[PDB]
Amino acid sequence: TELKKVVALYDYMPMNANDLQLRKGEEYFILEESNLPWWRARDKNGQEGYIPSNYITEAEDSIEMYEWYSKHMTRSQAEQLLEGGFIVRDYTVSVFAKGVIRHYVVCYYLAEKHLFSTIPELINYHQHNSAGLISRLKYPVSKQNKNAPSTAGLGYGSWEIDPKDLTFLKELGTGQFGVVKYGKWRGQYDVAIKMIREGSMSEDEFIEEAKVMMNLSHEKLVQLYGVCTKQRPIFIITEYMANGCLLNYLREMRHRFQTQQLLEMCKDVCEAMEYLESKQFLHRDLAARNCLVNDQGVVKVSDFGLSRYVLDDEYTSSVGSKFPVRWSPPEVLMYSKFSSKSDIWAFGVLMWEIYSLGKMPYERFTNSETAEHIAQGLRLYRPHLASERVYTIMYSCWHEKADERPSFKILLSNILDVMDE
Template sequence: MNSIILEEFFFKKSQQKRRTSPCNYKERYFVLSKAELAYFEHRPGKKPNLKGAIDLSRIKCVEIVRSDILIPCNFKYPFQVVYDNYCLYVFAPDKDIRQKWVCALKEETKNNNTLVPKYHPNFWVDGRWRCCFQTDKLAAGCLEYDPNQNASKKPLPPTPKDTRRLFSDPGELVVVALHDFIPQSAQDLMLYKHEEYIITDQSDPNWWTAQDKNGDTGYIPSSYVIEKSPDNLEAHEWYNKNITRAKAEQLLFNEDKEGAFMVRDSRHAGLYTVSVFTKAHGSNGENNPRVKHYQIRVTTCGETKFYLAEKYTFNSIPELIHYHQHNAAGLITRLRHVVSSGREKAPMTAGFSYGVWEIEPSELSFIQEVGSGQFGLVHLGYWRNVNHKVAIKMIREGAMSEEDFKEEAQVMTKLSHPKLVQLYGVCTQQAPMCLVFEYMESGCLSDFLRSQRGSFSRETLLGMCLDVCEGMVYLESANFIHRDLAARNCLVGENQTVKVSDFGMTRFVLDDQYTSSLGSKFPVKWSAPEVIHYSKFSSKSDVWSFGVLMWEVYNEGKMPYENQTNGEVVKALSSGLRLLKPKLASNLIYQLMEWSWKERPEDRPSFTLLFHELAELAEL
């Protein structure tokens, strides 16, 4: 394939090229190259099946779709690709990803000879354009098309420059606070759970400017709020995003209450499942504790309706849940007790406050030494008060390039995701320099696996791999390379949640034995061939390392190539040998490992594709 620019899972609307074609929405894996926009059907364990391709030279217009209609799929941010006499509607999971693709597509097509002077900013629905009400599908557009607007050769950066700008969508963005937030500096704004706020600036992805009901403004962590919308499930306590079937069952059994329930993402993207616990009697008359899973279904014709039992349909999922909380109506029991995974605990923030990444030494309290790492000792401590537990890494002199790290620290603090260990900031005003991180109770993944060996279910091991892969999808999308992904560089927290740590840190290591592939400390056993031979790092070399990490997980912390030297490993890899299948790994899991260990980087999957494959296996 030609040089790939972008890859992403999206939903696409059927183009209904024939009058009798049904209207539907299907998930497809989109690949933008220098020559074409192609999309593939995802088939678990099989090679993706090409479903369509558009030569870039045929594209007449690429633009965001602005509409007020209900979008009946999980991805709510549409854009359009107009080509020949057709319009392809694509639905992205968020605004940033949509903007990245629109910019990239515009850049690649801005010099096409067939560009339209005007385009339709709204959908073609029910035989007319919603923007100008013309009934001819091929009618000229009603808004001037600017092929150069927002065009950029590069995708949007993960950490925008700190130039404040208003968000571009018309109208006010109203959000609801999911958690209380206590200001950490004079520039922050207090948040009260369940109260509404108006967002006036969201140029920084992690810290937005908000206005409260009294007219006061300040910075708030974006992860603490959710857009106010009747269709936004994340505002509800019963919704558990990205939780596996096995994890849902574990939480519901732990609750052990009749009618304990949650709503979670289904294994089929864009759909949802209600999981409910019951002690209803079995056929033998005895209690039979179990979890039932009901997929929330959507009507296929006419107005969009949601239902669990066909006789009871509703305009929205919250209405459906509210009804079944009071009526079983075809379910094994009514939905009585909400079970939520981690919703009571506020998420980590990118830094303690907006723009503050240098931490005062006097604000840190050292409690006890909890370990030692590549750079020095690690202490459990507190920031400012006993309520904010942190991990403090003390950097021993000569261990890393401190000046280089200081230059990058501000960028690294802005990398924020639930499956990354958050770097809060640095303390450089005294020696030794300290790095302040989120504290993870159960320590590094490799030690945790070894200490609990024999107690893990296969579902739990798969969940650990999913956690790591999810964090790496974020780093991949931010064009950030980890360079040293391994179980020793992942940490375990509450509910056995695994997070990726020490991303990008090897850039600052001054130890020649660690940075040279000839050194005994170099992580050869986790390194891709192009890293060993040419020091060529990329997201695809991270994918190779992730394959080895999966092997570690399914061997419960065993050292890869345990009895071989680095030299022997390099020789074995060059001859095509790979790690053997772990006993706890299924054939499909091992196939993903083998896919990650392809000799050529371009033959390896992206983290996005790997996550989708793992999610299918976990029946998300």
Template sequence: MSARLLLEEMLIKRSQQKKRMSPLNYKERLFVLTQSQLTYYDGRRERKFRRGSIELSRIRCAEIVKNGGEIIPCQNKYPFQVVYDTNTLYVFAPSHDSRSLWVHSLKGEIKDNAVVSAKFHPQFWQEGAWLCCRQVEKQAPGCEEYNLFGDISRKPLPPIPGEEQSKNKKVTDDPTHTHTRAHTHTSVSSFFLLQQRRPPPPLPPEGDDDDKEEEEEVMVALYDFPGTEPHDLSLVKGGEYVILDKCDVNWYKARNQFSEEGYIPSNYITEKTSENLVQFVWYSKQVNRNKAEELLRKEDKEGAFIVRDSSTPGTYTVSLYAKSAPGEGGAAIKHYHIKESQGSPLHFYLAEKHLFSSIPELIEYHKHNAAGLVARLRYPVGKQDKSAPSTAGFSYEKWEINRSELTFMKELGSGQFGVVRLGKWRAQYRVAIKAIREGAMYEEDFIEEAKVMMRLSHPKLVQLYGVCSQQKPIYIVTEFMEHGCLLNFLRQRRGSFSLGSLLSICLDVSEGMEHLEANGFLHRDLASRNCLVNDSLVVKVSDFGMTRYVLDDQYTSSLGAKFPVKWSPPEVFNFCKYSSKSDVWSYGVLMWEVFTEGRMPFEQNQNHEVVTLVTRGHRLYRPKMASPAIYDIMQLSWLERPGDRPSFSQLCLMISDALEGETPPPN
């Protein structure tokens, strides 16, 4: 007879054995508590794959974790711990109530365990030390007394053979229960002597430890990667690689089938699981509705299709092109939301009569049967000949670039720091090279910051590859963007943009800024002139954080022409107070630039006049191409109080919703 189910919830688990912690060490797991085990699973509830299981009899402590101001790099901010054998499992709940319920339930189930601890560590074990007491031994005795919560009493510890009960020991009766509580009066030394006389706890069953499985995590290469340094490992598209260490968010150490080891870029690989859509040619993660329509029209084939993320996180849409759709009078693009059935087992469908246990099975079926769609899914579009993404630097921990390896080509333009040229690194990688004019910036401070900026890797941020800092002038080497700055791109193509194209530009920028916001990084000078456009018409945010290193006093003075007053909120031009919400204000002005196709904001006013107007509550007018709903988003970005403005994650959802309009499922 199976043990009774007590609790079941999606929580986040921290890796127990990794030496270095990063957001990649925090994984969502389905936790299930029964009267005999705490088990956690990978995957959906209906098709769960067991990652780990702990017998409740092995648990020594279940308690909340006092955070102590440490940053928690996952969305669940309420940690608790389960101490068993010689391990500590850290779990992160989504709310205070959720955490309390789990800790309360666990304590209730383990209250009679012979191995319950006398003391525990109230803060995290992190980077080789206990944060609470700074002890560096992982098995060091706890520094705070461990108690079961007040409404559950604990039986006294069994006496140690041959040891007389101390005459001075006090036994306190619990006024609400008949049991006595001797736990808090048992000496730590007696407790550990007792532990030594007991047989050691059983070893965990083979294969039940999540971290052992994660250490043998197998990934599939999405792109070729020719290693550029001796410590790199080259990747072959479609090849399988075992991950040895997740060094940081951008670079992993891996082993190939020939037992060769080295560093690989994390965005060039994906998990090898049947439910991971990234490995399929028909799935395009970074494609929104408007870009999907552009790609399908360009392909112009009956049955051309893309599977992409919907605006609702965790759901997917099939965008399908038909040359002659009923009732359309010509070619049409339909967007079908992939639905999930209610109850168990879980099924996916486009048409309710045709249910499938996985999305790949659904796609395979509709390749051969329209079954209510306007056409069969014939031609996957989007990934053929897709260029590989940028990497965070050319190799792991490589930020200094040898200038002899740079080839200079044509001049691209001139900015506040100096001349920008198109170039090549090692004669094969196209890059943009900024030569920093002497006296234009605080060079030493910037070089240190560049090491941090290189780690900010995202498809909607212009990638910094490294710097040449050993001699003057200093060079900044970045990703090359073929169409240059967004401002010129808008002005040169004025009159050719659809509403969807303009929204797509805004979404690209908001996604890049969302990544900066999530990493606590401020731009301080967000505007269309500081965004760039590549050959695939993807817009990326550039020059984030650079204004801090400018030596031009005019640029940071509200009286000077170079200060971006027209993009700045009142708290910046009045008090120089920057935050992610000041970047949100600038984003609203950038949206206005986009929907006016590159006009100058407040074009009839001088900077000092703009300061007066904005302080009095005046805002930019609604552009003709912006609907009232889109203008509402701009106005939310321009609210007087910074705390009232939306976050970039909220802006992403607003823009996505404006872009999306799902086609109902077929009958």
């Protein structure tokens, strides 16, 4: 069929009339191959004759041809011969530097790569050369709504909020302590203002401890901006969450999210609970009703610690008619022993709330019924939207022994893990 092509490695002047002249670099076609050291070839012009089979290589870009390459010339010999002057040998690329020689083994690639000290250096490189990537880095992707974080206070050193700077724009809700209205502070920044009905809380004890809660800053943690004592009944001012509480969101705003966003809702809360855990600050009543959702769908936890200052015994007492029994572990129901682990238990139930899109935990049971059955070993079943792995996480929160339950550090790790899928 087709003729085998070769390249002349060396010049060859014909020694007689049988010979064909070879010119280095030029290409020739074999008419007759053989174990013999002479082959019958054809010039690129059509001229024919015999050429030394050792003076030629095979068809595509072989190696003996180019400048550098030096077969089996030892490392020592290559060093004697050898800024940036190089050669390749049996592979290995040897280079002269300042005087010294650097050797790089070729396995086609060296072995190592560009060793950048920082990510920005890496990015700067591939913005100039694709060097192995699918395309040169050309355009960094945007974030239409960047949004700055929350400041621990509305300016430095201001717990007191002057209601002259508060414009009551819209009523939004009606929390357990009073009417939650929405407004701008100094007619610029959005702020949620929560009325506290008199008698609801022991103001003196609460407000003094709000000073601490002020200095609790975290991106997934509904920022407490301040309070006002002059205007009574009082008013705690907090970060504005445009989509209201998570429970109502899970139930009445289902068109606003996909089931693949649920795990992220858990992650958001978990990041927040890790923070409160690190500050050894117990939330005391973690539940979907106490998480809020902002304009961008981010879930943040609110009303953390707030139950310590509720005067209504029916909320505080573990035997009370409105106590969060359905979110409470056995140790809280039996001996009112709150701890990080009680928050973790609550989180498990909160995870369940999220994945059942806001269904009431143990909805068939009474609070005392739930208490008894939990204590026996009744655990919330897997919601349909929760995968085996996700359920394993929320279930771990419900271990009857407190110290055997994960930490929010651990849970956060586990959640980011399945998010990968």
